[PDB]
Amino acid sequence: SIKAEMDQLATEIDSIGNSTAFGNTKLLTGTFSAGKVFQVGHQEGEDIKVTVKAS
Amino acid sequence: QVRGLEVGMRNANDAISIAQIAEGAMQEQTNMLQRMRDLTIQSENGANSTADLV
């Protein structure tokens, strides 16, 4: 009976990982494993990198 | 000389008008080029998608 409870809790850790999205882009499934780039200046090279490992 | 200058005056007023029109058109090309710069900066989000870039 205790395992039947642990088993379902692990299913949601999977479910949150595969659901969390920004409109339509999944953020916790490794597409941000190699940090993506945002440009915050007005010239080339002024970038910020955000890395989210798969969980 | 008197009549020669009078025709010469109108000759230069014509050149002023040509330079005036060309300068006016290049101003509008400059504004649209600035908008292209913003779109290139805007197109660098990491939250965009393949359909968004199109």
Residues of B in contact with A22 (CB under 8 A): 47
In angstroms, rounded to a whole number, what is the distance separating the alpha carbons of residues B47 and A45? 19
Q: How was this structure determined?
A: cryo-EM
What's this structure's resolution in Å?
3.5
Q: Can you read off the two tokens belonging to residue B33?
A: 């080029």
CB-based contacts of B19, cutoff 8 Å, min separation 6: none
Closest CA to A35 of B24, B40, B21, B46: B46
- Whether the CB of B31 is below 8 Å from some CB of chain A: the reply is no
The separation between the first and the last C-alpha atoms of chain B, rounded to the nearest angstrom, is 66
Residues of A in contact with B47 (CB under 8 A): 22-23, 25
Question: Residue A24, SS3?
Answer: coil
In angstroms, rounded to a whole number, what is the distance separating the alpha carbons of residues A9 and A19? 15
